[PDB]
Design an enzyme around this catalytic site. Structure first.
Site, PDB file in Angstrom:
ATOM      1  N   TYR A  64       0.875  -1.149   0.000  1.00 50.41           N
ATOM      2  CA  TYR A  64       0.000   0.000   0.000  1.00 50.41           C
ATOM      3  C   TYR A  64       0.915   1.203   0.000  1.00 50.41           C
ATOM      4  CZ  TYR A  64      -3.336   3.536   1.115  1.00 50.41           C
ATOM      5  OH  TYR A  64      -4.101   4.675   1.080  1.00 50.41           O
ATOM      6  N   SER A  67      -5.691   0.943  -4.849  1.00 48.64           N
ATOM      7  CA  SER A  67      -5.637   2.385  -4.641  1.00 48.64           C
ATOM      8  C   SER A  67      -4.210   2.885  -4.596  1.00 48.64           C
ATOM      9  CB  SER A  67      -6.362   2.798  -3.376  1.00 48.64           C
ATOM     10  OG  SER A  67      -6.309   4.204  -3.240  1.00 48.64           O
ATOM     11  N   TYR A  68      -3.825   3.568  -3.526  1.00 48.49           N
ATOM     12  CA  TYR A  68      -2.466   4.088  -3.475  1.00 48.49           C
ATOM     13  C   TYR A  68      -1.479   2.959  -3.727  1.00 48.49           C
ATOM     14  CZ  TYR A  68       1.446   7.049  -2.158  1.00 48.49           C
ATOM     15  OH  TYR A  68       2.617   7.771  -2.161  1.00 48.49           O
ATOM     16  N   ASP A 100     -15.837   4.428 -10.429  1.00 45.15           N
ATOM     17  CA  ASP A 100     -14.964   4.917  -9.361  1.00 45.15           C
ATOM     18  C   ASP A 100     -15.071   6.435  -9.194  1.00 45.15           C
ATOM     19  OD1 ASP A 100     -12.763   5.367  -7.520  1.00 45.15           O
ATOM     20  OD2 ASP A 100     -11.875   3.453  -8.178  1.00 45.15           O
TER      21      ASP A 100
HETATM   22  C1  LIG Z   1      -6.447   0.535   3.992  1.00 47.95           C
HETATM   23  O1  LIG Z   1      -6.376   1.436   2.910  1.00 47.95           O
HETATM   24  C2  LIG Z   1      -6.766   0.876   1.737  1.00 47.95           C
HETATM   25  C3  LIG Z   1      -6.452  -0.435   1.400  1.00 47.95           C
HETATM   26  C4  LIG Z   1      -6.887  -0.950   0.192  1.00 47.95           C
HETATM   27  C5  LIG Z   1      -7.628  -0.167  -0.681  1.00 47.95           C
HETATM   28  C6  LIG Z   1      -7.941   1.136  -0.362  1.00 47.95           C
HETATM   29  C7  LIG Z   1      -7.520   1.663   0.866  1.00 47.95           C
HETATM   30  N1  LIG Z   1      -7.825   2.985   1.176  1.00 47.95           N
HETATM   31  C8  LIG Z   1      -7.299   4.094   0.403  1.00 47.95           C
HETATM   32  C9  LIG Z   1      -7.894   5.236   1.074  1.00 47.95           C
HETATM   33  C10 LIG Z   1      -8.695   4.834   2.135  1.00 47.95           C
HETATM   34  N2  LIG Z   1      -9.382   5.624   2.946  1.00 47.95           N
HETATM   35  C11 LIG Z   1      -9.230   6.947   2.641  1.00 47.95           C
HETATM   36  C12 LIG Z   1      -9.981   7.839   3.541  1.00 47.95           C
HETATM   37  C13 LIG Z   1      -8.443   7.443   1.592  1.00 47.95           C
HETATM   38  C14 LIG Z   1      -8.338   8.909   1.337  1.00 47.95           C
HETATM   39  N3  LIG Z   1      -9.524   9.321   0.643  1.00 47.95           N
HETATM   40  C15 LIG Z   1      -7.749   6.555   0.788  1.00 47.95           C
HETATM   41  C16 LIG Z   1      -6.916   6.910  -0.335  1.00 47.95           C
HETATM   42  C17 LIG Z   1      -5.618   7.349  -0.108  1.00 47.95           C
HETATM   43  C18 LIG Z   1      -4.809   7.658  -1.192  1.00 47.95           C
HETATM   44  C19 LIG Z   1      -5.325   7.492  -2.478  1.00 47.95           C
HETATM   45 CL1  LIG Z   1      -4.333   7.864  -3.809  1.00 47.95          CL
HETATM   46  C20 LIG Z   1      -6.610   7.040  -2.725  1.00 47.95           C
HETATM   47  C21 LIG Z   1      -7.395   6.745  -1.620  1.00 47.95           C
HETATM   48 CL2  LIG Z   1      -8.981   6.182  -1.843  1.00 47.95          CL
HETATM   49  C22 LIG Z   1      -8.677   3.359   2.239  1.00 47.95           C
HETATM   50  O2  LIG Z   1      -9.251   2.648   3.028  1.00 47.95           O
END
Ligand SMILES: COc1ccccc1N1Cc2c(nc(C)c(CN)c2-c2ccc(Cl)cc2Cl)C1=O
Ligand SMILES: COc1ccccc1N1Cc2c(nc(C)c(CN)c2-c2ccc(Cl)cc2Cl)C1=O
Ligand SMILES: *[C@@H]1O[C@H](CO)[C@@H](O[C@@H]2O[C@H](CO)[C@@H](O)[C@H](O)[C@H]2NC(C)=O)[C@H](O)[C@H]1NC(C)=O
Ligand SMILES: *[C@@H]1O[C@H](CO)[C@@H](O[C@@H]2O[C@H](CO)[C@@H](O)[C@H](O)[C@H]2NC(C)=O)[C@H](O)[C@H]1NC(C)=O
Ligand SMILES: CC(=O)N[C@@H]1[C@@H](O)[C@H](O)[C@@H](CO)O[C@H]1O
Ligand SMILES: *[C@@H]1O[C@H](CO)[C@@H](O)[C@H](O)[C@H]1NC(C)=O
Ligand SMILES: *[C@@H]1O[C@H](CO)[C@@H](O)[C@H](O)[C@H]1NC(C)=O
Ligand SMILES: *[C@@H]1O[C@H](CO)[C@@H](O)[C@H](O)[C@H]1NC(C)=O
Ligand SMILES: *[C@@H]1O[C@H](CO)[C@@H](O)[C@H](O)[C@H]1NC(C)=O
Ligand SMILES: *[C@@H]1O[C@H](CO)[C@@H](O)[C@H](O)[C@H]1NC(C)=O
Ligand SMILES: *[C@@H]1O[C@H](CO)[C@@H](O)[C@H](O)[C@H]1NC(C)=O
Ligand SMILES: *[C@@H]1O[C@H](CO)[C@@H](O)[C@H](O)[C@H]1NC(C)=O
Ligand SMILES: *[C@@H]1O[C@H](CO)[C@@H](O)[C@H](O)[C@H]1NC(C)=O
Ligand SMILES: *[C@@H]1O[C@H](CO)[C@@H](O)[C@H](O)[C@H]1NC(C)=O
Ligand SMILES: *[C@H]1O[C@H](CO)[C@@H](O)[C@H](O)[C@H]1NC(C)=O
EC number: 3.4.14.5
Lengths: 727, 726
Positions: free
Chosen positions: A508, A591-592, A669
């Site tokens: 991640y 995501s990230y 999305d």
């Molecule tokens: C365990 O984390 C994950 C594990 C697996 C998938 C998604 C997640 N993500 C990603 C995420 C989550 N939550 C928030 C609030 C945010 C910020 N909006 C984000 C976020 C942060 C950066 C980028 Cl580039 C895009 C996104 Cl979506 C989340 O649960």
């Protein structure tokens, strides 16, 4: 003995039991068993059926959820629930009168309500409907309208907009009652000139023309929404007069340019604390506002303000921290990065300058969980110097040095990761360890931190897991430049350090992330290791959190650098371990994690044979202001434009010639726009790189609908297995 | 020894040479060479240089195209070209004076012009800009504005909306000069209540995706409406506006939804108009005369020509074009006869019925020229090969004297001709497309003497003798007593004792034809030459050029027989001894992709795998004109049941039996990405795994250089994998 298979994971064959409860007083709590709602006495453990699952059999609607008034007198039936974003949604509601055993049938709450909430005491209601705020002093009394300015996609009273919902409040709600019930404070959002993201929603086969979804969404650098604050007096409402709202202006250091309202916490009955953050998240102000009974207005004595700056990075883990006010609201406690950039607890006195650190050390305090006049209870990763462990601590308010750990020793081998839930006034507490063993729910009295009982041991799940060849998890650390960086490995059953195994890198890697921990998961990675004998590894490198600013800030203004770099270096180390077939090293993230997985596959390191990237980000100008600008600054020539453009996935396309890449994205999305993956694929085609893809019609960032979730993991398992010559 | 490779296909290593000429009178044509425009004399063959390849080296603009005026005096220069749909676009225009040898810089034609046209004689211009028609009498002079109602995406003057462009006129233009240059006839389209197809365009640097919006009637939706106007260009005041005289559709059309499907000037004062009911089984041809006295144009109801159809729709894809005798009092057009074969028919204005001048178990493909003595037409008569084309002439004075002009020219190499006549037809260029290499020759009409060869593709032939090319077979099988033709691209050193994988190449839409004698160098060539795959196509029920009994088999029941028949053909190929039935794929594009999907979803048993490119998935998603033609309307009182029974989504369970690869462009304005989005969702929902690929910003054609190279590479990887090929 059978293995832990993909169906087991997709079908949820091995469920974890939970004990989720709601504290209703200093010594009772509610718990729903078999769809029966029960009240429990904490000291003794005795219970009574509060509402019997039979109660509503003849209701006429599937009941999605329920909310019981603080004073036990009424209950809200939530039905017709339709999900919007992460937190937001709308629903129908009805109220049942207990001491009458019937449904209030007039002044019904309107359908399509966006939010509802009881006052903290008694049975007042505030609700938001068509972006406007309403109040019902009594469940069968006609509600009073608080605001008239509300407009779809433009003006939001009491609810957040898309980016405040996701990035600021982690909630749809923008409504805060005073502890009393007198005052209802609310935020107001204007998205008048915020640009719209637009995409097609295809809907059921039966829809002839696709629908275009239009959502106000500020991309990094774009025009953000503006925000106002107001406090209404809920007692003096005239059925005859329009309720009048007092506005609390933001500090002057804020109005000189773009700012966000980032935290709202009531201190006393007549004191409210507001936190504000500059669009450059370098600099936040905590205002303290006292109510004037004479005037009728709120005053934020300037000299009272507390200022929080950061020069190495941004303010907070993701935002300025929550304040925990003492009883008289004259002091409070707040987590703050210390002089060595390790996050610790600070004691603030109102009308004094600076602050006092009651904890210190090379570890970090995750959260303040309860305050009394003798003790502050908090969570931290101090025990055994493990950043991926969590324990409950109390510190003597009369003697800071007298710190005692409540959870460390209860079951030191099964539990190294706890969270906690205290009763009002903190008489009792429920602990919850998440690993590394099976999850365990225990109750405790606070007076002498004695264990009252076990609430859930997951004995059933344990029994099942006997017949199964479960994998194990290692949690060690490597050394990079005389620094510890942590990592976890989901080892296959019957692991042998002589044999070579293929290794999938699970990333991640985002700012303040943490993927190496002591918690017990049943996930895909579990199946991969148990059934297909794949070693799934995760690594927390530069930019990861809970290890102090040194590490977490390495990445400031520089996403797609060290954290990408370190996922790769980590892999290197991993081949150097005598049981990793380095000809078979995949990577993957969502995501990230997908943005990182793509930058890695595109770096040319040659380390990785393949990887998957799910709903990745591809270029930071495509993601939202609040999150992106936090780590990247603005995308202008005066600020950080250069690295904005130096840090895209598209500019690395050529090297994807070196690997088999699978690219996945839901068409719906609303968060990471399908755009992002669209630009990735175009760059790849424009340079002649073969790669594999898969889009998901009308799925969003979570690709979490049953079918889709089943389908994507299935598809990805095929890909990995092929890429590993696995049978 | 080398083979035809993928890189060859994609990098255009072996180029077909062509000869595209532009007849500019009765005995001269034009020809581009080193980017020099030459004029050629047909009779003698001599040429001189008409435009020096250096003339506009100082233009400061890449020239897209040229267009010389009828009288030879002026030339049009197309630059700033921006493609829109299949035929429409925008460009900038400069007019170059040939006598003066200079660029007219006064009253220039606007940037972003949507269409330009010289009059048929003289040097007049009609152009459309911002959906309004303008007319320049002389290049240098101020334009005159004819229409004032033009309005983007709503009111179209002198140009077509999306559906008229694609489905009706196969052209952007909706202007028709009279033979004189006197009258200008235009049509007008109102899309006010036509719903919009919306999709994203991501483009380059662009932060927010752009949402595209096209008026586009899906099956059953609100169609655009049409009006028709005629203007007298001789009488244009620089002071008063311009009177446009409206000709209204016949009443048998105004009852309800209809289309204007044909505009043909017969003389200086007679216009032919075809109209078509939205239920495309009935059309009326009006005949409209000018009135020197009253100004109006009159279509005597008395003299209308009426076409009906019981077994299907009217015409192949539309009512056929009428070719008037010079005096304008009679005409010929292709019409289905008593046994439902399409032959040529002679019509006399004001006499009932028509007279067939051709008959037989074959069809006329088109009427190519008309002289006072002969009518020239192309047909598939020769050897009873429906996939062949030959040039014929018939003596107007004795319908029974029919001469084949192309059959015997080179019977071995040349079984498929097209023709291009000079103004009046003193000469014609024959053009051969196979089965041998393309052959371009010139002929005098006087007594059909061969004048000269123009291009014989010797260069290419020489290159190909070095390569192990595939051969093509063309034959038929009999099913239920009928002959159905098919072809195969067979690998070099083909050995019937061996076993080959077989890829069924499918299109199969109504009136289609995939088994012909044309010479192609395409992906299937590479598949056969390099990968030793037999690439086959089959013309089953619903296909064209073999009479209504086959072509109408599919009427109101799309997604049935054409699918079943594709399936049976593949069974029949296994029955032949050289097919490995364990490796039998299937692919197609557009209508082909839909058919390929329905087949894969039939639980047939026969296909291991298949690819579908830009398929249709349910017929309500597709456009009205095309769809309502074969299916009728999707209402309970019409054909909604079969609309509902003929989707791909509803066959999803069956895909757990095949490897399926689904591909589609995101900006497909024609078959909307929607159709694929609904297919994948149906597969997700039922648990079936499948391969997929999208193309950012590609349309139905997926034809940009990179996208094109990419999909064919990707599709090869897939087929090689499916066939376990090294
Ligand atoms: C365990 O984390 C994950 C594990 C697996 C998938 C998604 C997640 N993500 C990603 C995420 C989550 N939550 C928030 C609030 C945010 C910020 N909006 C984000 C976020 C942060 C950066 C980028 Cl580039 C895009 C996104 Cl979506 C989340 O649960
Ligand atoms: C042998 O034809 C092909 C062969 C290979 C690719 C494309 C083509 N197609 C398909 C096509 C073409 N041309 C027109 C005018 C139309 C009419 N819409 C169509 C058409 C017909 C039916 C459906 Cl479902 C959709 C479409 Cl786009 C064309 O060249
Ligand atoms: C939401 O913010 C917008 C933008 O500031 C406000 O609209 C402006 O209102 C003022 C006074 O009416 C003027 O500057 C302009 O006429 C408006 N400009 C724009 C861009 O529309 C609007 O007042 C705000 N709405 C609320 C409820 O506060
Ligand atoms: C194009 O068509 C639209 C309707 O398809 C016409 O608009 C209608 O015309 C009447 C009479 O002028 C108006 O009263 C209505 O407001 C219109 N209805 C709708 C649905 O908009 C329009 O006049 C036509 N324009 C031209 C140039 O033909
Ligand atoms: C010179 C002249 O009369 N031109 C007219 C103009 O006044 C008007 O704008 C238009 C309305 O259709 O018709 C044209
Ligand atoms: C409802 O409650 C009873 C106990 O009173 C319980 O035994 C029964 O199974 C419940 N039904 C459910 C789960 O809805
Ligand atoms: C628990 O036990 C005592 C003794 O009966 C009683 O007063 C109390 O109401 C019980 N509490 C609950 C939650 O039923
Ligand atoms: C409150 O303000 C609203 C909106 O401005 C207005 O319609 C109304 O007059 C006021 N309410 C009453 C009844 O006083
Ligand atoms: C709650 O607090 C406010 C201000 O302190 C006061 O006006 C009101 O009377 C209080 N109500 C209660 C519950 O005592
Ligand atoms: C270690 O130091 C080297 C050289 O300074 C640097 O390239 C590398 O990124 C560093 N690694 C870490 C994780 O600090
Ligand atoms: C062809 O030859 C004739 C006789 O010289 C000549 O008059 C004519 O201009 C020539 N045409 C071309 C195309 O050069
Ligand atoms: C076409 O566009 C260019 C843009 O600079 C302009 O200079 C030129 O004058 C235009 N031509 C016409 C006809 O206006
Ligand atoms: C063409 O025909 C029209 C018919 O009315 C006539 O008025 C006009 O003079 C003719 N034009 C030429 C160029 O002879
Ligand atoms: C042959 O006949 C059978 C029914 O007798 C039918 O199912 C099939 O469609 C026919 N095949 C063809 C090509 O007509
Ligand atoms: C909402 O619609 C429901 C149907 O679910 C209807 O019965 C009811 O009257 C509506 N509720 C309110 C309070 O508007």
């Amino acid at each position: 003995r059978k293995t832990y298979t993909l169906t087991d994971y997709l079908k949820n064959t091995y469920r974890l039991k939970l004990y989720s409860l709601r504290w209703i007083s200093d010594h009772e709590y509610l718990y729903k068993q078999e769809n029966n709602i029960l009240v429990f006495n904490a000291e003794y453990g005795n219970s009574s059926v509060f509402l019997e699952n039979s109660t509503f059999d003849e209701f006429g609607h599937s009941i999605n959820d329920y909310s019981i008034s603080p004073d036990g007198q009424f209950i809200l039936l939530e039905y017709n629930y339709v999900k919007q974003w992460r937190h937001s949604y709308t629903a129908s509601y009805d109220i049942y009168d207990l001491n009458k055993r019937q449904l209030i049938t007039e002044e019904r709450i309107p359908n399509n309500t966006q939010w509802v909430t009881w006052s903290p005491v008694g049975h007042k209601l505030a609700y938001v409907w068509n972006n406007d705020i309403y109040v019902k002093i009594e469940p069968n009394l006609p509600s009073y309208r608080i605001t008239w300015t509300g407009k779809e996609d433009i003006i939001y009273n009491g609810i957040t907009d898309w980016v405040y919902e996701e990035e600021v409040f982690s909630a749809y709600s923008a409504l805060w009652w005073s502890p009393n019930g007198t005052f209802l404070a609310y935020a107001q959002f204007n998205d008048t000139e915020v640009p719209l993201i637009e995409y097609s929603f295809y809907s059921d086969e039966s829809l002839q023309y696709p629908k275009t979804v239009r959502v106000p969404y500020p991309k990094a650098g774009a025009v953000n929404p503006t925000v106002k604050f107001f406090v209404v007096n809920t007692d003096s409402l005239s059925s005859v007069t329009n309720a009048t709202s007092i506005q609390i202006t933001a500090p002057a250091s804020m109005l000189i340019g773009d700012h966000y309202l980032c935290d709202v916490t009531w201190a006393t009955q007549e004191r409210i604390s507001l936190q504000w953050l500059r669009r450059i998240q370098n600099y936040s102000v905590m205002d303290i506002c006292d109510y004037d009974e004479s005037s009728g207005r709120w005053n934020c004595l300037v000299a009272r303000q507390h200022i929080e700056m950061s020069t190495t990075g941004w303010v907070g883990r993701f935002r300025p921290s929550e304040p925990h006010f003492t009883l008289d609201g004259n002091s409070f406690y707040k987590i703050i990065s210390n002089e060595e950039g390790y996050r610790h607890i600070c004691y603030f006195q109102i009308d004094k300058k600076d602050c006092t650190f009651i904890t210190k050390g090379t570890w970090e305090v995750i959260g303040i969980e309860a305050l009394t006049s003798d003790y502050l209870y908090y969570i931290s990763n101090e025990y055994k110097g493990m950043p991926g462990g969590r324990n409950l601590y109390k510190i003597q308010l009369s003697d800071y040095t007298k710190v005692t750990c409540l959870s460390c020793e209860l079951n030191p081998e099964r539990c190294q990761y706890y969270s906690v839930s205290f009763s009002k006034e903190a008489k009792y507490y429920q602990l919850r360890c998440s690993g590394p063993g099976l999850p365990l729910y225990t109750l405790h009295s606070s007076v002498n931190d004695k264990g009252l009982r076990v609430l859930e041991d997951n004995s059933a799940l344990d029994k099942m897991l006997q017949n199964v060849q479960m994998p194990s998890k290692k949690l060690d650390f490597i050394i990079l430049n005389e620094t510890k960086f942590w990592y976890q490995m989901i080892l296959p059953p019957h692991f042998d350090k002589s044999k070579k195994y293929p290794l999938l890198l699970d990333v991640y890697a985002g700012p303040c992330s943490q993927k190496a921990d002591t918690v017990f998961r049943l996930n895909w990675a579990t199946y991969l290791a148990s059934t297909e004998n794949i070693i799934v590894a995760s690594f927390d490198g530069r930019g990861s959190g809970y290890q102090g600013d040194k590490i977490m800030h390495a990445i400031n203004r520089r996403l797609g650098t060290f954290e990408v770099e370190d996922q790769i270096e980590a892999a290197r180390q991993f081949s150097k371990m005598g049981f990793v077939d380095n000809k078979r090293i995949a990577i993957w993230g969502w995501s990230y994690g997908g943005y990182v997985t793509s930058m890695v596959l595109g770096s040319g390191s040659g380390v990785f044979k393949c990887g998957i990237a799910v709903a990745p980000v591809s270029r930071w100008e495509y993601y939202d202001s609040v999150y992106t600008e936090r780590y990247m600054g603005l995308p202008t020539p005066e600020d950080n434009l250069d690295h904005y453009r130096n840090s895209t996935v598209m500019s690395r396309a050529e090297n994807f010639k070196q690997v088999e890449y699978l690219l996945i994205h839901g068409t719906a999305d609303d968060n990471v726009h399908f755009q992002q993956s669209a630009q990735i694929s175009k760059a790849l085609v424009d340079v002649g790189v073969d790669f594999q893809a898969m889009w998901y019609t009308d799925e969003d960032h979570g690709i979490a609908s049953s079918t889709a979730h089943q389908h994507i993991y299935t598809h990805m398992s095929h890909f990995i297995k092929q890429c590993f010559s696995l049978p």
